[PDB]
Design an enzyme around this catalytic site. Structure first.
Site, short mmCIF file in Angstrom:
data_model
loop_
_atom_site.label_atom_id
_atom_site.label_comp_id
_atom_site.label_asym_id
_atom_site.label_seq_id
_atom_site.Cartn_x
_atom_site.Cartn_y
_atom_site.Cartn_z
N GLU A 11 0.77 -1.23 0.00
CA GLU A 11 0.00 0.00 0.00
C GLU A 11 0.80 1.29 0.00
O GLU A 11 0.22 2.33 -0.24
CB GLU A 11 -0.85 0.10 1.28
CG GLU A 11 -1.84 -1.05 1.40
CD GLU A 11 -2.91 -0.90 0.37
OE1 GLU A 11 -3.14 0.14 -0.23
OE2 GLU A 11 -3.64 -1.94 0.24
N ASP A 20 -6.74 6.36 -4.55
CA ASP A 20 -6.19 5.06 -4.74
C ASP A 20 -6.33 4.64 -6.23
O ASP A 20 -6.82 5.35 -7.11
CB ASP A 20 -6.86 4.11 -3.76
CG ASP A 20 -8.29 3.86 -4.15
OD1 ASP A 20 -8.87 4.28 -5.16
OD2 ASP A 20 -8.82 3.07 -3.29
N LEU A 32 -8.74 3.91 3.35
CA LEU A 32 -9.79 4.50 2.52
C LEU A 32 -10.64 5.51 3.26
O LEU A 32 -11.15 5.27 4.32
CB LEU A 32 -10.71 3.44 1.93
CG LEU A 32 -11.91 4.18 1.33
CD1 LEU A 32 -11.57 4.77 -0.04
CD2 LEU A 32 -13.12 3.28 1.29
N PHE A 104 -8.21 -6.58 3.54
CA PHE A 104 -7.86 -5.20 3.79
C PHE A 104 -8.07 -4.44 2.53
O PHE A 104 -8.57 -3.35 2.54
CB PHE A 104 -6.35 -5.21 4.13
CG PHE A 104 -5.82 -3.85 4.51
CD1 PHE A 104 -5.66 -3.50 5.85
CD2 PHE A 104 -5.43 -2.94 3.53
CE1 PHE A 104 -5.10 -2.29 6.26
CE2 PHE A 104 -4.94 -1.69 3.92
CZ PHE A 104 -4.74 -1.38 5.27
N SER A 117 -12.45 -20.17 -5.02
CA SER A 117 -11.04 -20.08 -4.58
C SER A 117 -10.90 -20.47 -3.13
O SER A 117 -9.99 -21.20 -2.79
CB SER A 117 -10.41 -18.71 -4.70
OG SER A 117 -10.60 -18.25 -6.02
N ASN A 132 -7.50 -20.12 -10.19
CA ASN A 132 -8.81 -19.56 -10.03
C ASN A 132 -8.77 -18.11 -9.57
O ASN A 132 -9.54 -17.26 -9.97
CB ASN A 132 -9.61 -20.42 -9.03
CG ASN A 132 -11.07 -20.05 -8.98
OD1 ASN A 132 -11.51 -19.35 -8.05
ND2 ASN A 132 -11.80 -20.39 -10.04
#
Length: 162
Positions: A11, A20, A32, A104, A117, A132
Site C-alpha cells: 500500500e 487510490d 480508505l 484489507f 477459490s 482460479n
C-alpha cells in the site's frame, strides 16, 4: 516478514490525501476515507478519523494508528464471517497473512465472494486456487499486487515480498 510489513509494501505510506488505484480518496497506509468525490466530504471523514482539524495532512504516528486499527478490523472481519473464518482457521501462518491482505484491500464481502477459490484454499489445492484466483477483476486491475498475494497462497512462503 509479517502482515504489517507485507501491507506496508503493497500500500505504501502517504501523509497527504491521495486517490487510490480506483480514484478514491485515501491517506496513510491504504486507509480508505470515502468513495465520494467531494473534497469536503473527504476533509470531514479525515478529521473525524484522526480526531482533529487536519487540512489533508497527517503525521506518521497518525498514519500508523489508523493502520493498526485497520489490520485489527480486517482480522476481526474474517473471524466474524461465516465463509471466511473456516478458511482462515484451516491455513498456516503465512497464508493467513495473504488472506488478511485481500480483506484489507477489498473488504470482507468482496473476498467472501471468491467462493470457488476459498474452497480450493481450504482443500489445500494451492495451484488450482492460484489459477482460479487469477480469473478476476482484482488480478486484472492490480496484477503486480495480486501476483504477490497469489504466490504467497501458492507457496506458503514470503518469497514474493523478498
Amino acid at each position: 516478514m509479517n502482515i504489517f510489513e507485507m501491507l506496508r509494501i503493497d500500500e505504501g505510506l502517504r501523509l497527504k490525501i491521495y486517490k487510490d488505484t480506483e480514484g478514491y480518496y485515501t491517506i496513510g497506509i491504504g486507509h480508505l476515507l470515502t468513495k465520494s468525490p467531494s473534497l469536503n466530504a473527504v476533509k470531514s471523514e479525515l478529521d473525524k478519523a484522526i480526531g482533529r482539524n487536519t487540512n489533508g495532512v497527517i503525521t506518521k504516528d497518525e498514519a500508523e494508528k489508523l493502520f493498526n486499527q485497520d489490520v485489527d478490523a480486517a482480522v476481526r472481519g474474517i473471524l466474524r464471517n461465516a465463509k471466511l473464518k473456516p478458511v482462515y482457521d484451516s491455513l498456516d501462518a503465512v497464508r493467513r497473512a495473504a488472506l488478511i491482505n485481500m480483506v484489507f484491500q477489498m473488504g470482507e464481502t468482496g473476498v467472501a465472494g471468491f467462493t470457488n477459490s476459498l474452497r480450493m484454499l481450504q482443500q489445500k489445492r494451492w495451484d488450482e486456487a492460484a489459477v482460479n484466483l487469477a480469473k478476476s477483476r482484482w488480478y486484472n486491475q492490480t496484477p503486480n499486487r495480486a501476483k504477490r498475494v497469489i504466490t504467497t497462497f501458492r507457496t506458503g512462503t514470503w518469497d514474493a515480498y523478498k
